[PDB]
Short mmCIF file of C-alpha atoms and ligand atoms in Angstrom, two decimals:
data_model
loop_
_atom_site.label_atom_id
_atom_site.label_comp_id
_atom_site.label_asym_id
_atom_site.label_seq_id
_atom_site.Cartn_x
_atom_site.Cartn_y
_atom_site.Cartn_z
CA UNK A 11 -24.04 -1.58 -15.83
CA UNK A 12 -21.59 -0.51 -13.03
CA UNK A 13 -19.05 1.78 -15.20
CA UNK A 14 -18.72 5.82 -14.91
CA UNK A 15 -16.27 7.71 -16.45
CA UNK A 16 -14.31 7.08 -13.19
CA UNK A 17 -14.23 3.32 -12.45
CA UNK A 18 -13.60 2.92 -15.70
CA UNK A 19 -10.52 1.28 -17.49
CA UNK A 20 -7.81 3.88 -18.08
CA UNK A 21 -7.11 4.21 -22.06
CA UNK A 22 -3.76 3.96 -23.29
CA UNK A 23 -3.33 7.39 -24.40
CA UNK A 24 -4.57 8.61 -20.47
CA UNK A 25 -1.34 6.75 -19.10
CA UNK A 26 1.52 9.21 -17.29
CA UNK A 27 3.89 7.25 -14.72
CA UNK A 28 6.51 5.41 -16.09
CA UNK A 29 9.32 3.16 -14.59
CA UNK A 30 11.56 6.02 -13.75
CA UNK A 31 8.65 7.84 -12.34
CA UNK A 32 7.01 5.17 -9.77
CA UNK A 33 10.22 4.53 -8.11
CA UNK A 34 10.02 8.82 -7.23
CA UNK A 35 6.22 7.42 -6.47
CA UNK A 36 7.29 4.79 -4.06
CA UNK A 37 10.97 6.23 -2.76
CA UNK A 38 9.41 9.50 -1.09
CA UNK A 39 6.50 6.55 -0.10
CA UNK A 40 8.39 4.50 1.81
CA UNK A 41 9.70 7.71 3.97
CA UNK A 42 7.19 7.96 6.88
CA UNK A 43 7.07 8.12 10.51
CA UNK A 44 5.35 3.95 11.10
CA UNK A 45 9.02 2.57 10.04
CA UNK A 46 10.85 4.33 12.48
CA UNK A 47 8.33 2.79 15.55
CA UNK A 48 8.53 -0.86 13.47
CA UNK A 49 12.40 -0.76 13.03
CA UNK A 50 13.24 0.65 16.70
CA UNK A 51 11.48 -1.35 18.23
CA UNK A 52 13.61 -4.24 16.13
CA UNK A 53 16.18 -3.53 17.83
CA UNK A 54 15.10 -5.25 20.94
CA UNK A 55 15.22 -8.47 19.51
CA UNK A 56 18.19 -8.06 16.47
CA UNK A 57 20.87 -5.89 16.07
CA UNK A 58 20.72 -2.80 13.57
CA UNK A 59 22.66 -4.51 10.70
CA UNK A 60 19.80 -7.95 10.63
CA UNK A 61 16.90 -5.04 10.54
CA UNK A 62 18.52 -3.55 7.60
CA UNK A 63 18.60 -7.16 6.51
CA UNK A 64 15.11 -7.79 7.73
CA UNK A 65 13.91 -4.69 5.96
CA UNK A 66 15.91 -5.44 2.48
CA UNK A 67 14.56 -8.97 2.71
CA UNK A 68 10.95 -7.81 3.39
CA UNK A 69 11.27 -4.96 1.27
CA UNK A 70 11.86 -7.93 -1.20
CA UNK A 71 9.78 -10.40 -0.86
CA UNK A 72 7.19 -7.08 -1.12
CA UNK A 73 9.00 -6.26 -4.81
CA UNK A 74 8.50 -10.33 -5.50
CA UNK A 75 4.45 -9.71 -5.00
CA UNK A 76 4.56 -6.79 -6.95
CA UNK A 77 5.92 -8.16 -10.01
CA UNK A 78 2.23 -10.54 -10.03
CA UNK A 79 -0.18 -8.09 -8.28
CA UNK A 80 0.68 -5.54 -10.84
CA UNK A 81 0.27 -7.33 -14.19
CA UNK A 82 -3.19 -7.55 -14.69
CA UNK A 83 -3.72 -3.45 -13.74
CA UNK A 84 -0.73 -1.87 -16.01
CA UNK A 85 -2.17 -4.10 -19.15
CA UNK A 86 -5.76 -3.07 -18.51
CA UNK A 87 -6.23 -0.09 -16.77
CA UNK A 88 -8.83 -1.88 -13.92
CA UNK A 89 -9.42 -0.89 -10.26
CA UNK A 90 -8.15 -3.27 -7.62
CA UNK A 91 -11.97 -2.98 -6.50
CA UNK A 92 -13.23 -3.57 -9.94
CA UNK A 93 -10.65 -6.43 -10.47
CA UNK A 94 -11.39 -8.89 -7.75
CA UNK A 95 -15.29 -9.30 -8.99
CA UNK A 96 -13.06 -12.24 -11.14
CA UNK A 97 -12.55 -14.96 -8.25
CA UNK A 98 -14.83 -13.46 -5.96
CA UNK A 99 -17.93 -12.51 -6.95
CA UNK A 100 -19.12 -9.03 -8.40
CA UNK A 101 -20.67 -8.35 -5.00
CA UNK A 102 -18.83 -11.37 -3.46
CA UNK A 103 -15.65 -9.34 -3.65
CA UNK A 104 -17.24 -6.48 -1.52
CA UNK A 105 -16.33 -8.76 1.31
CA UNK A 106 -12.40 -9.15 1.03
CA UNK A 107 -12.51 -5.41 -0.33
CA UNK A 108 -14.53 -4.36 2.71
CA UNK A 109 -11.80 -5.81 5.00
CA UNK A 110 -9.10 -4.08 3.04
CA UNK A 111 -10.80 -0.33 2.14
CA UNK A 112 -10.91 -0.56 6.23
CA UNK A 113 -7.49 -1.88 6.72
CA UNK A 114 -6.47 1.42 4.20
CA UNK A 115 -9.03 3.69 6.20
CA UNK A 116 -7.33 2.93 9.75
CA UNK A 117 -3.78 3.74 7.97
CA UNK A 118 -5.17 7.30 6.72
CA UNK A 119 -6.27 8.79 9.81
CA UNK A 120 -3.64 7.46 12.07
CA UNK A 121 -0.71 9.54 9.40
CA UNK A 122 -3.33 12.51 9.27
CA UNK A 123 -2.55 12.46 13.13
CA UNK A 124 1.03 11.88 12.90
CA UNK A 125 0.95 15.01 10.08
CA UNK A 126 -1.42 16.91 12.59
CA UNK A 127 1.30 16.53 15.21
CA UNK A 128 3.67 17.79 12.60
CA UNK A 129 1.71 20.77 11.96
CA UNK A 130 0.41 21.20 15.82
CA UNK A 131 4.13 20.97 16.78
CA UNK A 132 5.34 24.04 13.87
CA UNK A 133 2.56 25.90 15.37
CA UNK A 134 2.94 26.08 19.11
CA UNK A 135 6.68 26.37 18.31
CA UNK A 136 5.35 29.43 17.47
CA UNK A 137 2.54 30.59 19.33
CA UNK A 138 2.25 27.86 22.40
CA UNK A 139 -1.12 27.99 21.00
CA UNK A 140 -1.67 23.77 21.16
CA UNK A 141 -5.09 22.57 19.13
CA UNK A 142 -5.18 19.13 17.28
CA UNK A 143 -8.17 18.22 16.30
CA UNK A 144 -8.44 21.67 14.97
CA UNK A 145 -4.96 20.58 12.61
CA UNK A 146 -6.56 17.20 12.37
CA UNK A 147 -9.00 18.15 9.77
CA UNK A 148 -7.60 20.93 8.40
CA UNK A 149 -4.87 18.28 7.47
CA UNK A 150 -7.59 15.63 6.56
CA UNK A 151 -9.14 18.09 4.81
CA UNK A 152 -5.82 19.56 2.72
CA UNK A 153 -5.14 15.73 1.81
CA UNK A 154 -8.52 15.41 0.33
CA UNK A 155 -7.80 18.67 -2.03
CA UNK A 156 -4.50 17.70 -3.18
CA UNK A 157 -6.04 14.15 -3.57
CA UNK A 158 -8.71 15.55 -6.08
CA UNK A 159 -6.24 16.02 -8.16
CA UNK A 160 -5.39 12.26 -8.30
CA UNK A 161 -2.36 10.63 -9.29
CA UNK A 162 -1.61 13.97 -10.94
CA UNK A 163 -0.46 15.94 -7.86
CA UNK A 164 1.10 12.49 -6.24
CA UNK A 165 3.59 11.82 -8.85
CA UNK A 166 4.48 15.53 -8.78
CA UNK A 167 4.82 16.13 -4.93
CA UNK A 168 7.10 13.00 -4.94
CA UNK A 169 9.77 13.67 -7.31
CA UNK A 170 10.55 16.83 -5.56
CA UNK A 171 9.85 15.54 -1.98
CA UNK A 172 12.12 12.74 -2.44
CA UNK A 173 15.65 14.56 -3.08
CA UNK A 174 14.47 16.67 -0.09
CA UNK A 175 13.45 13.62 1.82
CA UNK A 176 16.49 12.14 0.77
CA UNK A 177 18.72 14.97 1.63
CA UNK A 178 17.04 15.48 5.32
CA UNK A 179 17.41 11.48 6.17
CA UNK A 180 21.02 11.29 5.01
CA UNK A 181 22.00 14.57 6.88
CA UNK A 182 20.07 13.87 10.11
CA UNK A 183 22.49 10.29 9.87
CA UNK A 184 25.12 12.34 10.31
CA UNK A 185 23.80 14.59 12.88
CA UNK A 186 23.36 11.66 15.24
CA UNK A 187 26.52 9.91 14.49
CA UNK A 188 28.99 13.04 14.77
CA UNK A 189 26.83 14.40 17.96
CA UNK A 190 27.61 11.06 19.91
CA UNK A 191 31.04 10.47 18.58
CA UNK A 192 30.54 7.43 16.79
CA UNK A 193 31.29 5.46 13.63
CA UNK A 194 28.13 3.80 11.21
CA UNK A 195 29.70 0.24 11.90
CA UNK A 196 29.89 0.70 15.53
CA UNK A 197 25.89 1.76 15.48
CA UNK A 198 25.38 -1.25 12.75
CA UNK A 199 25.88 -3.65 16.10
CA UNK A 200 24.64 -2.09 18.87
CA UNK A 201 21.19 -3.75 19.32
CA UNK A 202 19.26 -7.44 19.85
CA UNK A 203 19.72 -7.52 23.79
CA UNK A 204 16.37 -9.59 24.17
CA UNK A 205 16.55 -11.87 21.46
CA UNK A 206 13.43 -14.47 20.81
CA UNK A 207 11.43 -13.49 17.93
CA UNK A 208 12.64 -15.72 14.29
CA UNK A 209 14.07 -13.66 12.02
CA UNK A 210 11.36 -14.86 9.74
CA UNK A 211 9.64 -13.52 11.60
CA UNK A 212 11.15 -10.20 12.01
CA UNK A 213 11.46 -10.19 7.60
CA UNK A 214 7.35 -10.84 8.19
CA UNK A 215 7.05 -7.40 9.58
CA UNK A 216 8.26 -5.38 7.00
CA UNK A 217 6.26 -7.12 3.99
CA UNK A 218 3.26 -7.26 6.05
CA UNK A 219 3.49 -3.23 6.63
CA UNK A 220 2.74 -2.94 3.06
CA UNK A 221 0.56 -5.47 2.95
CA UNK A 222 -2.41 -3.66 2.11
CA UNK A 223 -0.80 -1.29 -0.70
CA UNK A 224 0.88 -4.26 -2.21
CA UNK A 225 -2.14 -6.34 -2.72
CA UNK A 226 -4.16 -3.40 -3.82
CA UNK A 227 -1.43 -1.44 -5.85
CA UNK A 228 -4.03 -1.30 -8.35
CA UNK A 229 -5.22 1.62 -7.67
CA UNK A 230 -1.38 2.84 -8.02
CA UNK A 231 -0.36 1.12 -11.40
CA UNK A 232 -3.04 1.25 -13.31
CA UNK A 233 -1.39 4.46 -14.18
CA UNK A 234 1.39 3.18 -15.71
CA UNK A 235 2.91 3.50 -18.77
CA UNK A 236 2.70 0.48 -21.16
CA UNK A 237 3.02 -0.46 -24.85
CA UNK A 238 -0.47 -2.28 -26.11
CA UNK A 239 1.71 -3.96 -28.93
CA UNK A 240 4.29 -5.63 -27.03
CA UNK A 241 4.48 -9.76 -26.35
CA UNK A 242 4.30 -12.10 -24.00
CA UNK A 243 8.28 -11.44 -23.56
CA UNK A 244 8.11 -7.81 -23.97
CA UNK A 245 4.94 -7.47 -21.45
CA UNK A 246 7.51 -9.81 -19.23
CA UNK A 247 10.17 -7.32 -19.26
CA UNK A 248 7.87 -4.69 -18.73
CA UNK A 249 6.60 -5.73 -15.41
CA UNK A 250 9.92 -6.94 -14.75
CA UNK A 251 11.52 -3.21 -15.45
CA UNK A 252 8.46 -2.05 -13.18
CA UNK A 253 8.90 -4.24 -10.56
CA UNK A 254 12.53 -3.15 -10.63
CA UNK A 255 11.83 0.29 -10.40
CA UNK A 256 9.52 -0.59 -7.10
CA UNK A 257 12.25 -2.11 -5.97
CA UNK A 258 14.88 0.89 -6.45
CA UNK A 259 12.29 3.08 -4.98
CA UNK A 260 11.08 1.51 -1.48
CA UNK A 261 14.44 -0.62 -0.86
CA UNK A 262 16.70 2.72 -0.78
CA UNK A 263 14.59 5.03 1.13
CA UNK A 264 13.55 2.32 3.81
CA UNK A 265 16.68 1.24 4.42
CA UNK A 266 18.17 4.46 5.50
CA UNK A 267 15.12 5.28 7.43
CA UNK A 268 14.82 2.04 9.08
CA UNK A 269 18.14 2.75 9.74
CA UNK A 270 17.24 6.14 11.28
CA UNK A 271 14.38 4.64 13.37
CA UNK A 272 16.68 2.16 14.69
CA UNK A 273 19.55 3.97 15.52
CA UNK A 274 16.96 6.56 17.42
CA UNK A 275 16.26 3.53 19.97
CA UNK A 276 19.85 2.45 19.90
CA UNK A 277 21.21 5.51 20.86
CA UNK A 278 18.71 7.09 23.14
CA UNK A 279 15.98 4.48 23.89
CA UNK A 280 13.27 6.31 21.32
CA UNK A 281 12.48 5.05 18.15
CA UNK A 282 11.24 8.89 17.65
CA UNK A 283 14.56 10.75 16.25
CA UNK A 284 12.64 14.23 17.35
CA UNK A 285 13.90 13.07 20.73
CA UNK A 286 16.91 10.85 19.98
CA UNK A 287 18.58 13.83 18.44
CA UNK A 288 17.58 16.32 20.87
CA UNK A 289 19.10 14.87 23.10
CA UNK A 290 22.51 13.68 21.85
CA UNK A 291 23.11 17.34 20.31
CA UNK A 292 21.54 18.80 23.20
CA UNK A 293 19.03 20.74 22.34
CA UNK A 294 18.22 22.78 18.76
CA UNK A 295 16.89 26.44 18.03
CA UNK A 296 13.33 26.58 17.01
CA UNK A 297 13.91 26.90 13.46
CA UNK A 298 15.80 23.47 13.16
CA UNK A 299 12.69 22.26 15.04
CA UNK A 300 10.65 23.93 13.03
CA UNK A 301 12.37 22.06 10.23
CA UNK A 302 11.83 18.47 11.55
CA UNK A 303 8.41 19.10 11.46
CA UNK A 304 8.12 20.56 8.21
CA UNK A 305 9.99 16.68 7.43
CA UNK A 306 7.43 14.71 8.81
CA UNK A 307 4.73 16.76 7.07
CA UNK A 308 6.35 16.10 3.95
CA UNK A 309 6.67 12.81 5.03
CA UNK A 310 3.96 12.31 5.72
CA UNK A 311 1.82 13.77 2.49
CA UNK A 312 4.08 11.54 0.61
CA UNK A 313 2.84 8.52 1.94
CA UNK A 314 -0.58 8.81 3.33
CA UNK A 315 -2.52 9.84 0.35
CA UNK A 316 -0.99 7.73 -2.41
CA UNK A 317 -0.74 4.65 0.18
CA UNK A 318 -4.28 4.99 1.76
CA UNK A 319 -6.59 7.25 0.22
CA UNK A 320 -6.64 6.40 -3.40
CA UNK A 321 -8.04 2.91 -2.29
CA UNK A 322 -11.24 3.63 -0.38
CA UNK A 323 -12.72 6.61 -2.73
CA UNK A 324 -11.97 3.77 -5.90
CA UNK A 325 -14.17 1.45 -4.06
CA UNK A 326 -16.68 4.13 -3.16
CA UNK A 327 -17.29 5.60 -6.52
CA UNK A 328 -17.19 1.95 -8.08
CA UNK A 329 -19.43 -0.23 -6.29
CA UNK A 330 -21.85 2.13 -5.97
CA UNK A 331 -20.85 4.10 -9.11
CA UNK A 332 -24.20 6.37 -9.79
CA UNK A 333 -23.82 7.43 -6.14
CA UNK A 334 -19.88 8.38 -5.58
CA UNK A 335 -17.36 9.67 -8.09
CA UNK A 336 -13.95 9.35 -7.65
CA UNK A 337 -13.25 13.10 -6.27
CA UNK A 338 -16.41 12.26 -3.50
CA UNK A 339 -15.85 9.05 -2.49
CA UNK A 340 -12.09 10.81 -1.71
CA UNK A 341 -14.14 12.98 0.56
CA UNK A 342 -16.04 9.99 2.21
CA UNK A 343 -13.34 8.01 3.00
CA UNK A 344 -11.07 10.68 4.79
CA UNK A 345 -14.03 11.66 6.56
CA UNK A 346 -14.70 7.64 7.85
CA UNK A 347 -11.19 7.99 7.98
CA UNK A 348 -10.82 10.42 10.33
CA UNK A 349 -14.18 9.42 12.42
CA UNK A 350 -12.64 6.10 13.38
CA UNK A 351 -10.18 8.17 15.32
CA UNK A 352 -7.57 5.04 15.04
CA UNK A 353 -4.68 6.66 17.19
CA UNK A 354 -6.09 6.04 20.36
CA UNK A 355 -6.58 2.51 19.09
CA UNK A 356 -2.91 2.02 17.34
CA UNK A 357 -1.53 1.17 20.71
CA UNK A 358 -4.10 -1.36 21.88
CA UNK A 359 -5.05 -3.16 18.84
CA UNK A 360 -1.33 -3.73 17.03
CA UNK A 361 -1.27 -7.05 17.70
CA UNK A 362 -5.09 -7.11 16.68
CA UNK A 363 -4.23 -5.05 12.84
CA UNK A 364 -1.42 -7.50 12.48
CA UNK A 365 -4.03 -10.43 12.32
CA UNK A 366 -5.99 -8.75 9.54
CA UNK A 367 -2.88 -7.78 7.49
CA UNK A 368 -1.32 -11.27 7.33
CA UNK A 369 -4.96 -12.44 6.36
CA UNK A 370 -4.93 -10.61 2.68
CA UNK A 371 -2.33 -13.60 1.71
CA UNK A 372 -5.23 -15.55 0.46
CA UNK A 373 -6.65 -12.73 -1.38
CA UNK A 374 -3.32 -11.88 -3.10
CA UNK A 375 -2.88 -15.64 -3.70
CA UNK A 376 -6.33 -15.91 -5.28
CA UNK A 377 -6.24 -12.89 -7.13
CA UNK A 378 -2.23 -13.97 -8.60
CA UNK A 379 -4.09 -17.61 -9.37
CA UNK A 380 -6.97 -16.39 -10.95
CA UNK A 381 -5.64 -13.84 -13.37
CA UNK A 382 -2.25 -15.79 -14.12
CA UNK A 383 -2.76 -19.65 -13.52
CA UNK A 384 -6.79 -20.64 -14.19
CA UNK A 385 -7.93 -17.86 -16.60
CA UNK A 386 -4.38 -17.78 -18.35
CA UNK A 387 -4.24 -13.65 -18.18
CA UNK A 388 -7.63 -13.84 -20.60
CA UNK A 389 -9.80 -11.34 -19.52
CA UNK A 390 -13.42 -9.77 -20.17
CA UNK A 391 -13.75 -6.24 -18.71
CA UNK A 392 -16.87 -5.95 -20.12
CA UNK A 393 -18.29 -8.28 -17.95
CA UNK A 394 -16.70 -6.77 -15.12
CA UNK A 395 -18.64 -3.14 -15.57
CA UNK A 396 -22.13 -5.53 -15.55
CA UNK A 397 -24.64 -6.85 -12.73
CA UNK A 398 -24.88 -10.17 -14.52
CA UNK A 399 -21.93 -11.69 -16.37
CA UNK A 400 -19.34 -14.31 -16.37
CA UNK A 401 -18.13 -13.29 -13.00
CA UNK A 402 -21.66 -12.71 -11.20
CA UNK A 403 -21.45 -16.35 -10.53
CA UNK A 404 -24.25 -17.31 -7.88
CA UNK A 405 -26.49 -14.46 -7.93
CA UNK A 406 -23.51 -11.87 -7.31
CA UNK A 407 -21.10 -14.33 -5.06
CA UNK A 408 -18.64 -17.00 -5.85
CA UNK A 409 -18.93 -18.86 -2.95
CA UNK A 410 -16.50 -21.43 -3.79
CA UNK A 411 -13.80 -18.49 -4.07
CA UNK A 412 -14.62 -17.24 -0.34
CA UNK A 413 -14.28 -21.08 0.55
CA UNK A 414 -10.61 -20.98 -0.66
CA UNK A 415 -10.16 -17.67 1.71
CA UNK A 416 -11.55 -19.19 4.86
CA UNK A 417 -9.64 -23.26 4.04
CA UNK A 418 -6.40 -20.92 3.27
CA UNK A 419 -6.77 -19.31 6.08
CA UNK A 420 -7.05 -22.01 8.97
CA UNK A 421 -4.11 -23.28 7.18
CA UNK A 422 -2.22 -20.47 7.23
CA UNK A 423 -2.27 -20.65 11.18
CA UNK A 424 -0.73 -23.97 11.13
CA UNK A 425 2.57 -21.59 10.66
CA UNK A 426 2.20 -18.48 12.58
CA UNK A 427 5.31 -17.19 12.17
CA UNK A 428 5.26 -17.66 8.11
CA UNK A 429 1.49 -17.13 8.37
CA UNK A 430 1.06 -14.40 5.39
CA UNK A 431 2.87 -17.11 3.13
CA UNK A 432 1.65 -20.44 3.89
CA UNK A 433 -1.85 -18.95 3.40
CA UNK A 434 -0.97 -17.05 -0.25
CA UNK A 435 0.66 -20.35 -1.27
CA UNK A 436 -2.27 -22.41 -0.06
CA UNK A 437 -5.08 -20.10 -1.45
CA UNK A 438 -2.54 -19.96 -4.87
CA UNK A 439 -2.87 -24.09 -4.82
CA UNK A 440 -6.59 -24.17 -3.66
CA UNK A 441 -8.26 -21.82 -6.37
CA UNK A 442 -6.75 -24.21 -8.96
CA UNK A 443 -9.10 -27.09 -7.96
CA UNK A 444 -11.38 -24.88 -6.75
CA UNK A 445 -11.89 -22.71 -9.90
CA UNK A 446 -11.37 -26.04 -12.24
CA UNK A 447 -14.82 -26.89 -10.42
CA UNK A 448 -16.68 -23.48 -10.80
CA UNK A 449 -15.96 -24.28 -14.27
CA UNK A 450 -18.46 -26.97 -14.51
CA UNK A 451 -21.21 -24.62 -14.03
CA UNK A 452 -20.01 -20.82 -15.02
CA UNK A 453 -17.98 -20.00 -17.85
CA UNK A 454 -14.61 -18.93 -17.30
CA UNK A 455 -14.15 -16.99 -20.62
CA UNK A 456 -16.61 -14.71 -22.67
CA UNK A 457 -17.30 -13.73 -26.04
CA UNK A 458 -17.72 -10.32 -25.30
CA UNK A 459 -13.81 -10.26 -24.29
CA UNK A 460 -12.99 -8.99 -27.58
CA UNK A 461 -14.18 -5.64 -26.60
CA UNK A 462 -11.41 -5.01 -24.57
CA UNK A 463 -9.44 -2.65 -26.54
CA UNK A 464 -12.59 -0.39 -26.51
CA UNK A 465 -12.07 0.30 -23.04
CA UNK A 466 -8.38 1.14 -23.85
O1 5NL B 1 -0.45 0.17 3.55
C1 5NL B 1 -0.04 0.95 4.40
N1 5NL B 1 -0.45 2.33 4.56
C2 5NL B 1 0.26 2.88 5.67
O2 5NL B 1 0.16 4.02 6.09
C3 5NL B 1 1.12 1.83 6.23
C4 5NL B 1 2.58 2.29 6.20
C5 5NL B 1 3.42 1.36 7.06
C6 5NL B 1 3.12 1.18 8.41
C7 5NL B 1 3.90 0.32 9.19
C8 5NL B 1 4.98 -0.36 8.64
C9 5NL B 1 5.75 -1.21 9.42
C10 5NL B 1 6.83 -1.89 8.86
C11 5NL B 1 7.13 -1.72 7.52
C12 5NL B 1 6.36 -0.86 6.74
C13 5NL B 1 5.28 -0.19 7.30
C14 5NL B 1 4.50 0.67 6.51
N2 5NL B 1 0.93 0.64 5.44
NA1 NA B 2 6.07 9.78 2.66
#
């Protein structure tokens, strides 16, 4: 057996976010630092009003995913770790998960830095007094305790960051525009002096950015609220009303940050608006500093955590689930977080990061096929918590299921600038035959799949 009270299915009655709730979850989410860098630099290739476009559009097609990723873990309460012993095997899936949980691990300690900054900055705005590794893992660290306290703390911190957040963004707009005497249609136009790169391309960016969270929100929605007696139409709707609310939440807040990050570049030549700002107002008092600082902690802790952390402790404490409970497996990932020290490797290996993001398209597109198309949403979680089961396959490892991954992902280079979707919509069409094979030899159903509701 592989279940502990924390990789375990999350019963009905232990449920708290709803749709109005995750929205506040993803809005104050979406507001961090890495859009401003992805939609300034934009501007070099499109102008402002296609990056808003670019963003909506790949804010979308993100929304799209989410309505499938998220099925299986509102209805059952599973891990994203936990749920992708289905295709793959039980210890087959440690291999896609391993990729990912290090994909997630990078992203944590490159915003601990960005916070540390934050926090280094307030400080020797103070004191001159300049030490950050010191505010590195004190920040790490601070994370990690708030993070104990799970989803709990999240879903509080973001409904009150997110007015705040809100109410900082839409005020530092104005800031910029008034300071350099200009209109928000003139800005909307100002960019795309060096165009080249598709605009598929360029929607490709933004979906890929939350690439990792979307095909692990798991870990996220297995949270949510849901009603065990619904239907087929009213579990529909459900997701649907979800998937909505994901949508109301990220769309919002990353368009008028995008917005931000872009205009920064546009107006100044920095995607950062610390300096865009600066300058077209001239210089600020070291409160209003001070301030900006304080926003990119708190937007920061919004994002980093929920986005990044939840993932690797989940698949600490839950493939090795005698050794690591949820609250230390939080601890060991921030640490190998943090000991990868990825922000002197951000610059260098972006085009490198890239690669591995637009390479979870298989995974999402087996993981959408397996739960929805060839198992027809028909589950057995009690095979799931067990060594040997209906989804240990061969000895552990469904081989046939990492075959799919590697086919869909030669494939998927055939169309490098679409490459994220031609390999999801290959490995989607692939597991079909593929799993209609397995078939012959494993079962794809279980008796013991009527014990379901006992986990809930
Ligand atoms: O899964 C994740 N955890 C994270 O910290 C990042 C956040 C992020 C980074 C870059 C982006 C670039 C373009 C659009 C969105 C982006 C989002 N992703
Ligand atoms: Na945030």
């Amino acid at each position: 057996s592989l279940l502990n009270p924390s990789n375990a299915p999350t019963r009905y009655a232990e449920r708290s976010v709803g749709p109005f709730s995750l929205a506040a979850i993803w809005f104050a989410m979406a507001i961090q630092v890495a859009i401003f860098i992805a939609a300034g630099q934009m501007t070099s290739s499109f102008q402002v009003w296609q990056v808003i476009v670019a963003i909506a559009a790949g804010c979308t097609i993100a929304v799209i995913l989410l309505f499938f990723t998220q099925s299986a873990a509102i209805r059952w309460g599973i891990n994203f770790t936990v749920a992708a012993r289905m295709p793959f095997g039980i210890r087959g899936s440690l291999i896609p998960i391993t990729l990912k949980a290090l994909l997630s691990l990078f992203w944590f300690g490159f915003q601990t830095w960005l916070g540390a900054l934050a926090l280094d900055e307030i400080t020797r705005l103070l004191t001159g007094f300049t030490n950050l590794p010191l505010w590195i893992v004190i920040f790490g660290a601070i994370q990690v305790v708030t993070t104990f306290y799970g989803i709990t703390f999240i879903r509080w911190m973001n409904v009150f960051a997110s007015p705040v957040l809100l109410a900082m963004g839409v005020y530092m707009v104005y800031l910029m525009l008034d300071g350099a005497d200009v209109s928000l249609g003139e800005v909307m136009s100002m960019g795309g002096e060096n165009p080249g790169m598709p605009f598929s391309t360029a929607i490709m960016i933004f979906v890929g950015g939350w690439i990792a969270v979307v095909v692990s929100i798991h870990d996220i929605v297995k949270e949510c609220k849901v009603d065990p007696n619904a239907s087929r139409e009213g579990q529909t709707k459900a997701d649907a009303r979800y998937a909505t609310a994901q949508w109301l939440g990220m769309v919002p807040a990353s368009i008028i940050f995008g917005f931000i990050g872009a205009a920064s570049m546009v107006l100044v030549g920095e995607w950062n608006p610390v300096i865009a700002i600066t300058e077209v107002v001239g210089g600020v008092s070291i409160p209003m500093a001070i301030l900006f600082q304080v926003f990119v902690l708190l937007a920061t802790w919004s994002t980093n955590p929920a986005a990044n952390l939840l993932s690797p402790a989940y698949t600490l404490c839950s493939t090795f689930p005698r050794v690591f409970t949820f609250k230390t497996g939080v601890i060991v990932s921030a640490v190998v977080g943090l000991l990868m020290m990825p922000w002197q490797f951000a610059g260098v290996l972006n085009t490198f990061l890239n690669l591995l993001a637009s390479a979870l398209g298989p995974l999402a597109g087996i993981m959408i096929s397996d739960y929805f198309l060839v198992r027809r949403r028909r589950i057995s979680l009690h095979d799931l918590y067990r060594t040997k089961g209906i989804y240990t396959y061969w000895r552990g490892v469904n081989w046939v299921a990492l075959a799919v991954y590697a086919v869909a992902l030669a494939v998927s280079f055939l169309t490098p600038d679409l490459m994220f979707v031609t390999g999801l919509i290959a490995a989607l069409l692939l597991h079909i035959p593929a799993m209609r094979w397995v078939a012959k030899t494993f079962p794809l159903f279980s008796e013991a799949e009527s014990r379901n509701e006992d986990y809930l």
